[PDB]
Amino acid sequence: KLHKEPATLIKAIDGDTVKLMYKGQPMTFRLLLVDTPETKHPKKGVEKYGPEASAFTKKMVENAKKIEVEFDKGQRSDKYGRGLAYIYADGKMVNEALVRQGLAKVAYVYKPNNTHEQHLRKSEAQAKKEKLNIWS
């Protein structure tokens, strides 16, 4: 029953986080089910492939005509107040694109927020087989 809703980009913040206008409110969104290397790591700062993951997410959302967010069936925000969602740029899921490119791993999954888990895991297996980026 997952449905997509429109949103407007405000700012990409990191590989795994984008700020969007949603239902007329600015909101920070964390991409569901993926871990990217970070530029804003609480303890490490800027990890390896972090600038790259960050640039990938940025370009993909900044250059899209349409951004949509899709909540999963469980919790829609985390303990930091970030929305938890799948983000689409012109119909293409940003979460999957990162994983397919070897710029994210599939995260530890917490049910029931696991609807696209298999699909993402499939893309991660492919990126690993192609030895892309993080897997190189």
Side-chain angles (χ1 to χ4, degrees):
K1 306 82 181 7
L2 300 204
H3 148 242
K4 291 151 183 72
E5 303 165 61
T8 296
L9 174 70
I10 290 175
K11 190 183 194 292
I13 290 144
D14 214 359
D16 68 1
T17 306
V18 180
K19 192 100 77 100
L20 309 170
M21 183 85 24
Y22 170 73
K23 272 157 120 175
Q25 294 296 323
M27 191 160 122
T28 301
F29 282 78
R30 167 73 165 83
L31 291 177
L32 264 164
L33 289 183
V34 308
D35 298 305
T36 61
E38 294 167 60
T39 60
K40 289 138 192 101
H41 189 116
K43 264 126 359 82
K44 183 171 18 269
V46 173
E47 321 177 82
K48 176 79 177 119
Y49 288 109
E52 281 92 347
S54 178
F56 185 92
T57 295
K58 189 151 186 300
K59 288 138 57 170
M60 190 171 176
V61 293
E62 284 190 338
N63 277 305
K65 330 209 262 193
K66 284 171 186 145
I67 297 292
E68 295 160 304
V69 303
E70 173 182 62
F71 291 105
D72 213 328
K73 301 168 351 250
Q75 316 88 86
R76 295 174 206 222
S77 60
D78 63 15
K79 65 180 145 81
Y80 297 101
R82 297 187 292 184
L84 288 167
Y86 305 106
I87 300 302
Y88 296 80
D90 295 321
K92 290 259 19 215
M93 198 201 300
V94 180
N95 317 48
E96 191 271 335
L98 291 159
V99 172
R100 183 56 184 92
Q101 204 59 227
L103 289 162
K105 324 180 125 89
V106 178
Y108 193 76
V109 173
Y110 304 106
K111 291 151 112 350
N113 278 350
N114 66 350
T115 299
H116 299 319
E117 185 186 4
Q118 248 288 45
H119 181 40
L120 288 183
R121 283 204 195 275
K122 264 49 150 332
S123 296
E124 181 188 71
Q126 190 67 28
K128 302 194 260 133
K129 171 150 159 231
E130 300 178 0
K131 293 202 236 71
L132 293 171
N133 285 314
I134 278 187
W135 305 115
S136 77

